[PDB]
């Protein structure tokens, strides 16, 4: 009765979003401002914030009511 | 995340049409309520009357929430003006004055965003008398609980704006042929306000707000960005999701395209006559 | 004392009042007119006098394992008796056990000076300074 | 379980300063019918 | 009118929570009325209200009602018989590695939706996991929870149980992601494997230093780029006690997701999906289905 | 001086705690059957008596409350110096060795 773990798919109707950590290795974080360095020593990387305009500017466009 | 949010499953109609339909029932059940308590009195005002009003209180909601003493996020404006939106979808103007739910739409913004402003502060940002802020603040409290009820408990607005960057990012990055997207970012602040005076925001998802903003941008400044919506977005292989986004954007586009502001004289006489009906209850 | 009696009508003033209610509760008859909620304000008024009962004899110190006594329906008073065994016979104890050492310092300090005579005078101050003087 | 009067001891602050919030208007749940009670004796 | 009041379960410092009955579905729920100046609705509950409006998941609690009165309202969550902490504290009922792995994948799964929404519980204690009788531990209280994606918006660093404190947040990080959330989860998997509270500070500084003396001070090659927080101290460099000897009775696996939870750098901090990937999870002992988790009777 | 619990906070809680279930009772009663209303207050009055009737024997016995500290703790000094000496003495065996192993 083991587990195996499923990404939760969550169906946003829009475009695919690139992951995370695969996102400054396709050029989106030049675009974004850098996370100071107080900042960084947080949990805030510049990468949470073009990540979330990413799936918000994709989050529904293949979708009416 | 929008596409799982409340806006989405209740707060994002089908058509104009069926917003006509809410509104003239909420006209009609306030109609109803005052002739069947003691029948075609011209002291009511029409639903195009109320829409005219909407939009003039709407105007002034803008203005308020430009002209708060601390700087208030376009979020919360956004999400203040949505507020005001549904609430008079749902409710009629006669039964609930526009500027006291004017007000209380901006408070309940503040408060649901995170824009942390005291009731002294808020009050101290109306141009009217330290009495007149004391009784203004008593009308947002009692008024408070009604909006949240008229929102169905719907509190979380998503506004175009963070799509908006999130697209120019995008477009920054995946979209060589486009140089300086940022004069698309002044053109499509303007469209996007022309777009939220409206009622697109019931409509239409704030993606696609936010990419008819856009790409309106670009068409008025002579650049073609069909290459980001067949490729960069791969809608060049689902043929029918790519039309159906463009169905989208002209219908929005138009919708923009057709909006009359509210004048000046009509505003007048409605404000008249509706001020006649709130103290004549 | 006076003090003590005080507070002692009220707590079994009380204890009436909550079999006044119970059986009036319990016998309850159509014949009964205002005499069920009367007994109800003695009572919530019985329960504040006696807050003001218990603060003059504040002075009063119940032990520990006194109310823990209380608290199981033990016998306190046996306790009293305890502690008087308790007391009596650990009198004993410490007498006792010094009177076993106190013939023990007697007796080998009287050895002590019979065993070496240049150092006589100094065994006499070892019994002078074992006294508590 | 008759050691509670020892327990409450330790945790004097359930109890506020005077006393906690009564309405005596609100009692009127001891308004009580004429009826019987079984696995109960006097 | 609606809901009919069953018991009264208890209050925190700005509710009071009825168990209840809607005449609808006879299904048990659980009120909360808030109670009440000059400020209007308290913004506890219309953070509740907002955040519990826009998510629906098995391991989130949710709002099936919200509603009210003049001035005051009551929202209606799914019932919980108790919380995890009830559960932690009950020395009757034993915690097997498969309650335990249990627990921790209910929790971690509520959380990763909960991220991946870019909502941030802010409040993550064994107190705040409830669970109903089918054993689903949901996460219990949002009245200090916020949105973490977006820069523009400066946060609070105060606000988590001290106890279940990232060492960031005590440092003052006015900015922070989803290793605040991590850290408590952490510290809650420490609590649930020894019983007792996990670094129980009396001050920030208590904390700081029982966090340190227990992990070990970083040294800014696990924690790179932690001296520009606004509250930094240095501090004494603690050597930090072994994780196989704090706790002497866990499994490889299961220190490897200790020592994931654990880490200083908020960005080297195992999130929520990573976490869930792990070989502790998948490794032989299951979890236990909800039913067949224990229940503190009485 | 602490082995002791003050006589006045002790009414003060039962009082108060009585006053307190009352209150807890008075909303449970409106809602519940005919039949079972009647239960709650018999087995509160009943449960409540039984906790004034500790008080009752509590004040009666007030009596001794000045002397029985006094020699709960005087006791225990003279047990503890009559046991101190016996554990006192089990270490000089140890030291009898231990320490001249030491010196």
């Known amino acids: 009765a083991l587990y195996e773990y499923q990404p939760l798919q969550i169906e946003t109707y829009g475009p695919h979003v690139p992951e995370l950590e695969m996102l400054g290795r396709l050029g989106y974080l030049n675009h974004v401002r850098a996370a100071s360095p107080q900042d960084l020593a947080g949990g805030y990387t510049s990468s949470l914030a073009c990540h979330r305009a990413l799936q918000d500017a994709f989050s529904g466009l293949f979708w009416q009511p | 995340m929008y596409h799982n949010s409340s806006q989405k499953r209740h707060w994002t109609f089908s058509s104009e049409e069926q917003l006509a339909r809410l509104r003239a029932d909420a006209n009609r059940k306030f109609r109803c309520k005052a002739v069947a308590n003691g029948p075609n009195d011209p002291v009511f005002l029409e639903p195009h009357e109320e829409m005219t009003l909407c939009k003039y209180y709407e105007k002034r909601l803008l203005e308020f929430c430009s002209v708060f003493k601390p700087a208030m996020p376009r979020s919360v404006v956004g999400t203040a003006c949505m507020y005001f939106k549904r609430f008079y979808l749902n409710n009629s103007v006669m039964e609930y004055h526009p500027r006291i739910i004017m007000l209380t739409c901006a408070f309940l913004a503040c408060k649901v965003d995170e824009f942390n402003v005291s009731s002294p502060q808020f009050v101290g940002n109306l141009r009217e008398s330290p009495l007149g802020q004391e009784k203004a603040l008593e009308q947002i409290l009692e008024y408070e609980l009604l909006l949240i009820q008229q929102l169905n408990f719907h509190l979380i607005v998503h506004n175009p704006y963070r799509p908006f960057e999130g697209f120019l990012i995008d477009l920054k990055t995946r979209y060589p042929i486009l140089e300086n997207p940022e004069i698309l970012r002044k053109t499509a602040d303007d469209f996007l306000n022309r777009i939220a005076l409206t009622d697109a925001y019931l409509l239409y998802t704030p993606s696609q707000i936010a990419l008819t903003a856009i790409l309106s941008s670009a068409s008025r400044a002579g650049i073609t960005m069909e290459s980001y919506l067949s490729e960069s977005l791969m809608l060049k292989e689902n043929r029918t999701c790519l039309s159906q986004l463009l169905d989208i954007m002209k219908s929005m586009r138009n919708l923009v395209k057709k909006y009359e502001p509210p004048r000046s004289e009509e505003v007048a006489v409605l404000k008249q006559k509706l001020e006649r009906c709130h103290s004549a209850e | 004392a ?132 | 379980d008759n050691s509670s009067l020892r327990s409450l001891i330790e945790k004097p602050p359930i109890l506020s300063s005077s006393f906690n919030p009564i309405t005596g208007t609100m009692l009127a749940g001891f308004r009580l019918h004429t009826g019987p009670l079984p696995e109960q004796c006097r | 009118k ?228 606004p509250d930094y101290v240095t501090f004494k460099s603690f050597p930090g006690i072994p994780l196989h000897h704090i706790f002497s009775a866990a499994g490889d696996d299961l220190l490897d997701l200790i020592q994931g939870l654990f880490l200083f750098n908020p960005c080297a901090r195992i999130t929520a999906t990573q976490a869930l990937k792990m070989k502790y999870f998948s490794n032989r002992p299951g979890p236990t289905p909800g039913c067949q988790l224990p229940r503190p009777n009485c | 001086a602490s082995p002791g619990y003050r006589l006045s906070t002790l009414i003060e809680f039962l009082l108060h705690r009585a006053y307190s279930e009352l209150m807890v009772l008075t909303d449970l009663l409106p809602r519940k059957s005919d039949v079972e209303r009647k239960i709650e207050i018999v087995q509160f009055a009943s449960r409540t008596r039984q906790l004034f009737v500790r008080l009752l024997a509590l004040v009666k016995w007030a009596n001794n409350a000045g002397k029985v500290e006094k020699c709960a703790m005087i006791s225990s000094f003279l047990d503890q110096q009559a046991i101190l000496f016996v554990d006192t003495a089990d270490r000089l065996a140890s030291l009898a060795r231990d320490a001249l192993v030491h010196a």
């Open chain 3, 2 to 133: 006076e003090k003590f009696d005080h507070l002692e009508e009220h707590l079994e003033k009380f204890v009436e009042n909550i079999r006044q209610l119970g059986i009036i509760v319990s016998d309850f008859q159509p014949s009964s007119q205002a005499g069920l909620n009367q007994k109800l304000n003695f009572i919530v008024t019985g329960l504040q006098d006696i807050d003001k009962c218990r603060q003059q004899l504040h002075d009063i110190t119940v032990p520990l394992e006194v109310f823990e006594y209380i608290d199981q329906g033990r016998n306190p008073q046996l306790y009293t008796k305890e502690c008087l065994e308790r007391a009596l016979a650990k009198n004993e104890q410490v007498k006792g056990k010094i009177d076993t050492m106190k013939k023990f310092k007697s007796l080998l300090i009287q050895e002590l000076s019979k065993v070496f005579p240049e150092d006589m005078a100094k065994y006499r101050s070892i019994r002078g300074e074992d006294h508590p003087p």
């Open chain 5, 2 to 229: 609606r809901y009919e009041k069953l018991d009264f379960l208890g209050e925190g410092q700005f509710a009071t929570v009825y168990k209840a009955r809607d005449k609808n579905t006879n299904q048990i729920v659980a009120i909360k009325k808030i109670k009440l100046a000059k400020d209007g609705i308290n913004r506890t509950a219309l953070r509740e209200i907002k955040l519990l409006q826009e998510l629906s998941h098995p391991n989130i609690i949710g709002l099936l009602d919200a509603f009210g009165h003049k001035s005051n309202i009551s929202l209606v969550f799914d019932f919980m018989e108790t919380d995890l902490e009830v559960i932690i504290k009950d020395n009757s009922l034993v915690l097997t590695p498969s309650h335990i792995k249990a627990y921790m994948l209910m929790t971690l799964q509520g959380l990763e939706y909960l991220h991946q929404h870019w909502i941030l519980h802010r409040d993550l204690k064994p107190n705040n996991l409830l669970l109903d009788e089918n054993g689903v531990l949901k996460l219990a209280d949002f009245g200090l929870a916020k949105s973490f994606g977006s820069p523009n918006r400066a946060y609070t660093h105060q606000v988590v149980t001290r106890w279940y404190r990232a060492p960031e947040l005590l440092f003052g990080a006015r900015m922070y992601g989803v290793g605040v959330d991590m850290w408590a989860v952490g510290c809650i998997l420490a609590e649930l494997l020894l019983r007792v509270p996990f670094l129980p500070g009396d001050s920030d500084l208590d904390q700081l230093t029982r966090i340190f003396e227990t992990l070990g001070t970083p040294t800014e090659e696990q924690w790179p780029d932690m001296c520009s927080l």
